[PDB]
Write a structure and sequence with these properties.
Two copies of one chain form a homodimer. In chain A, strand 2 (20-25), helix 1 and strand 3 (49-54) form a beta-alpha-beta unit. Helix content of chain A is 27%, strand content 28%. Chain A has 269 residues and is α/β, with parallel strands linked by helices. Chain A has a ten-stranded mixed beta sheet with strand order 4-3-2-5-6-11-10-9-7-8, with helices on both faces. Chain A has helices spanning 31-41, 64-67, 93-106, 115-125, 171-175, 214-224, 250-265; strands spanning 7-9, 20-25, 49-54, 61-62, 72-77, 107-113, 130-144, 158-168, 180-186, 190-196, 201-204. Chain A has one domain (18-269): Class I glutamine amidotransferase (GATase) domain (Rossmann fold, 3-Layer(aba) Sandwich). The longest helix of chain A is centred in the last third of the chain and has 16 residues, at 250-265. At the A-B interface, strand 1, strand 3, strand 4, strand 8 and helix 7 of A face strand 1, strand 3, strand 4, strand 8 and helix 7 of B. Strand 1 of chain A pairs antiparallel with strand 3 (49-54) of chain B, so a sheet runs across the interface. It is classed as transferase. The entry lists the keywords NP_981826.1, homoserine O-succinyltransferase, Structural Genomics, Joint Center for Structural Genomics, jcsg, Protein Structure Initiative, PSI, transferase. It forms a dimeric assembly.
Chain lengths: 269, 269
Amino acid sequence: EENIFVMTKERAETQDIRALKIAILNLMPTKQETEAQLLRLIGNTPLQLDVHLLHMESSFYKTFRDIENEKFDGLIITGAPVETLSFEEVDYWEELKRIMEYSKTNVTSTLHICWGAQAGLYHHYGVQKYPLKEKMFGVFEHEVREQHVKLLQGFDELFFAPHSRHTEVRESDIREVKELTLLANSEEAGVHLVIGQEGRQVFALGHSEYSCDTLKQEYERDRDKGLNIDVPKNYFKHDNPNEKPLVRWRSHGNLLFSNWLNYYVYQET
Amino acid sequence: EENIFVMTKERAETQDIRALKIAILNLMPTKQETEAQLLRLIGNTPLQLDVHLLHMESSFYKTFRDIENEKFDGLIITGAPVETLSFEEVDYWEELKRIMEYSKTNVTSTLHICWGAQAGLYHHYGVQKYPLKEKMFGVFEHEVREQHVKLLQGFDELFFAPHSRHTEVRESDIREVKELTLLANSEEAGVHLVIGQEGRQVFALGHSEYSCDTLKQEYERDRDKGLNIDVPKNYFKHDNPNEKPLVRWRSHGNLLFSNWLNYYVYQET
């Protein structure tokens, strides 16, 4: 045949797509590290992003007051160093409730990380947290629990993710809630990824956003405070803290944030 | 402060980038499956791709004759069912030599898969292949051997990839070649990813392009021919062939092809 056809994979015409409006609520005291991590991870999209930084009310930062009449495509609520308290004992609990209630109506998809996820689950769905006898601490094997869920687009069926917490939510408590769907659990570490109301909320209980040495730094920090803490599991070679950490969770951290931004924060029509 | 700044991750301005010209040389007899797999995998880029299908000389297909005066951004040379023969005994060896020589000068980066990789290594660098006493067959853990190599951008330090072959190349033989750099090996399966001349050639000895049931189909095909073949390793749960395969290699198959296309096939200036 004289005229041969070619296969053309059409370029992504994202040029004319309106920028995604994204807010990050950093509840951390070690503010800079978290911000940097999340900023790298949301680079995982060809789309343009306007990132608004927020914090509580006890110069790039705003408060809920400044945005309560605004709408966002996405919101990230980080973890916080308050997990051993009852939710209501946390100083800023009432302001956090206003933000989370606001998120139902004014944010397309809100991503909750670690304690922020527990807070979101508790407030929105009544899921309680519970103390662990020792810290769930290391990198753990997870398994995908749902097929054909956009958030898990491209995930390996088995994948690694870090956890760092002295508390937990229980699979059984999440199972009871119709509006929740369990996406990824670990035989050892339990619940990691959960989605609520079709992605209206995304909850990540582990710390997929962690960078290379985060667990290492936490280990040494706690060890120096004189805490009795074990080496993070499946992190150091031979459990030797002088060794370079093994990074097995990087790819699925990128996939999580990329799929969130691409399929949940961005909506068509 | 009255004027708060926002962080903006700028959208990828790939709109005005010329389409990447890519050729796929399918040496397989089971032609359609391979083509489909590779086509899905090269969808992993926001860039536009013109894909030209080629085959040997013993309607979307062309031959080397049609393109010998052309230049390509990228070329994929698949594997083939001829691994037990000496390279020179393979019917189309001489035409394949012309193509591979052509690739040095007329293709920016050529990706070689499985036997195609052995052929490329042998022809370009004198690396010989050797018979295995039993088939290297299953999904295997690999480790990254080089930091800061674009092809391994976003890779976990440990990752899974399939192998399916009764022959091998040896790490030591690859080590001797200055123009070759070993990127990923496996304690069990040996050499997987190698790069030659700064990405001018990329060699993948394993089969990261394999889809879910490929190893399953091969197992049953060989078992039915009356061959004595073991269950693929780390593939079926409990080594039970009636079970759904475990897919641990999907993410790094996508990363491989995405990084190849983005950082080796596409060049600036």
